[PDB]
Design a protein around this ligand. Structure first.
Ligand SMILES: Cc1ncc(COP(=O)(O)O)c(CN[C@@H]2C[C@H](N)[C@@H](O)[C@H](O)[C@H]2O)c1O
Ligand SMILES: Cc1ncc(COP(=O)(O)O)c(C=O)c1O
Ligand SMILES: [Cl-]
Lengths: 409, 413
């Protein structure tokens, strides 16, 4: 059968056990003798990425929101985001009362096309959110150059690329702030979870306050007594409670340990598949940027020519492969419809949002981003747990697609 | 039982461990994970909480604060709206309102319940007002008879903030079931906790579906829960309303299911002890316990509150009173402390510092800091809150607190 995801061991279980033995289940819970799982996780992930500051939080969505809040973003601002991504990239912007402004993606990476960014920049633009989508990385060299020239911040959405390396720098480390999801499907997971990283110490403080009802850590854990609060008032910036449970921080500490190993396994299997699948006619694989030395695969993506597969759309191509391979819709599916065409994206439906950002239904749906729209219609996405199988088991994917090619010659 | 130590919080057992194991056995850690043959912990917990509360619909979420925020969104509250809240509460009650681009409007609390004073609500009502958020604070309930009458007369919604009152009963209805939507926190210090978490409940079927969508990126569960395969998504697109991800992890939903098992009985222990304290403490001259309305047949005590007259206690404030008591009982600060400052005076409340909030609602430091609610203001200076863990001790342990308070009265007689 196909690999399950997530994967736990007894180390997972021990880490939970430590939480129960601590009797501290939240960071807003008082000190009970030793450091919290949150801070231990924050340190370990920050060292994993060679970045100095990390603040855990509740989700990838909330991580983006906090990041935007920390950069002073608000009413009247525009934030540039890719047309092809999971809707959270966009709705995070809406959630801080800014307008997301879409830009199409490159055909070979499905990451935001730096050559189209300039043309979307306006007086209101304050930031860009590139997404390291599926199993690639947005072009951070070009994107940082554009941002530096137009005075814009850069928030990396690393939800699908935990541990990717671009010119010796881990994903999330290269813009001003890096945002991560630890939702079940992701390569680093506790069911739900969020992470922020940054090199900037001012941002570190503001992000703590944003996620802890305006509080920061105390100056020195080492002088806390049993019963004392570790979180203390600051009030430089208003926050709400987006604190990660100690149970989740503990599982992340466990899961982190096997991250680089499992990423290399995935990456090598992506390679196998590129080699295999590219030999089939009318199957295109993604192009790896030179700058990337280590690529994390959350989803492995290839493209098909509908002219050589009997006019199949990817919904149908995927329904066939799922029946032929005996794997479900979590494991195999087309990319997200681009955000403006995605029924889950519907800001006009809620009053919270400003009149000026919710536009109308026709407004948003009538937008056009042809690379993104094509990609959704003629690409197949394989969930990364499949990149943890035996290469002999992967050859079943290759043959299933070789059989489909053969049939529709 | 002789005294050895004050009870601590939280409290687990091996049933808690087994609930975590079941999550591992399931191989489903998020409600956004693939179907593995049985319903989520989320759903199991929702159904359990629904039954406990006598309420048709239940949707877990991530925190009390998000529960409040999502309840507001689900009632269509947004820019240009006002929402009435009490001055005396935790700041999340107000900041959840600012989060949806509405203006929180403070009303003072009643002297002998510290819950929103219904007689002051009419005066704060304007054309912008769309809802009231009563808080069932510490170990009282807001007056839902009066609040619902005012709400009906003025076409306002009512969201009950139940974070400090899980299981309280007003005229044979559980707290959270009486207004349009109930919101709950399951943060560590609460009586029902998984360290973090939240709950939303409603009677209204349309609100149930909206709330589902508001917490799972505009998704609901697929219709036929048992006509999908292992490895399939169970959340399907719906898109009636724009949502975000405010899904509770299966590990937390699992913990809550275990904890909920014991909730009613641990609440009864607390309440039996609160009554004993009210008996004992009300006999000390200068001490005033809170008044419990006859509509309340079960009161959940997140905190036991009593008041003191500084005139009869040497001019001490609450902070000093608490410090003495903690010294003499060897009790920690988490368990015995004055109540909250009023929200408008709380330093953690500083919405003007945040550009994300609309200029029109964040206003200025001068605006918020310069408000005045006397009853609520005096609360922190002359009240003592006992965290509910201490109420799981034996009655003879609690008598030690009574004697400490009585001794201190004697000194100043
Ligand atoms: C680029 C990007 N940015 C932000 C996010 C949001 O993070 P979370 O709030 O942790 O979900 C995601 C997660 N996206 C996933 C996508 C998946 N199809 C869905 O079923 C799942 O619930 C969600 O976690 C992402 O992929
Ligand atoms: C009355 C009240 N409302 C809302 C909240 C917010 O709950 P959470 O901390 O889980 O966001 C709390 C938490 O302390 C609370 O006491
Ligand atoms: Cl989608």
């Amino acid at each position: 059968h196909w690999p399950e995801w997530p994967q736990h061991s007894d180390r997972t279980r021990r880490k939970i056990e430590e939480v129960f033995q601590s009797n501290r289940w939240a960071i807003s819970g008082y000190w009970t003798g030793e450091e919290s799982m949150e801070r231990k996780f924050a340190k370990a992930f920050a060292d994993f990425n060679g970045v100095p500051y990390c603040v855990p939080t509740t989700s990838g969505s909330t991580a983006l929101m906090l990041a935007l809040e920390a950069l002073g973003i608000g009413e009247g601002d525009e934030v540039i985001v890719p047309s092809l991504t999971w809707i959270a990239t966009a709705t995070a912007v809406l959630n801080v009362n800014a307008l997301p402004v879409f830009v199409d993606v490159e055909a070979d990476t499905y990451c935001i096309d730096p050559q189209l960014i300039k043309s979307a920049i306006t007086d209101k633009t304050k930031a860009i959110i590139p997404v390291h989508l599926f199993g690639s990385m947005a072009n951070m060299d070009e994107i940082n150059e554009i941002a530096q020239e137009h005075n814009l911040f850069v928030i990396e959405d690393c939800a699908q690329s935990h541990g990717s390396v671009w010119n010796n720098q881990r994903a999330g480390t290269i813009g001003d702030i890096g945002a991560f999801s630890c939702q079940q499907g992701k390569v680093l997971t506790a069911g739900e979870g969020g992470i922020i990283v940054t090199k900037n110490p001012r941002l570190f403080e503001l992000i703590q306050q944003l996620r802890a009802d305006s509080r920061v850590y105390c100056d020195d854990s080492s002088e806390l007594m049993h019963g004392d609060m570790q979180l203390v008032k600051k009030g430089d910036i208003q926050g709400s409670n987006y604190c990660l449970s100690e149970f989740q921080s503990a599982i992340l500490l466990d899961q982190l340990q096997e991250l680089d190993d499992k990423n290399a396994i995935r990456e090598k299997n992506a390679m196998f598949l590129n080699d295999a699948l590219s030999k089939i006619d009318g199957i295109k694989v993604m192009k790896r940027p030179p700058q990337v030395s280590r690529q994390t695969y959350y989803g492995y993506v290839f493209r098909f020519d509908p002219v050589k597969f009997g006019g199949l759309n990817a919904d149908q191509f995927c329904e066939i492969l799922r029946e032929k391979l005996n794997m479900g819709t979590f494991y195999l599916h087309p990319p997200y419809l681009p955000v403006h065409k995605n029924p889950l994206f519907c800001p006009w439906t809620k009053n919270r949002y400003l009149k000026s950002v919710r536009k109308t239904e026709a407004y948003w749906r009538g937008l056009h981003y042809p690379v993104s729209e094509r990609a959704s219609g003629q690409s197949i996405v394989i969930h990364h747990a499949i990149l943890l199988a035996e290469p002999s088991h992967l050859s079943l994917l290759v043959d299933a697609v070789a059989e489909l090619a053969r049939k529709f010659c």
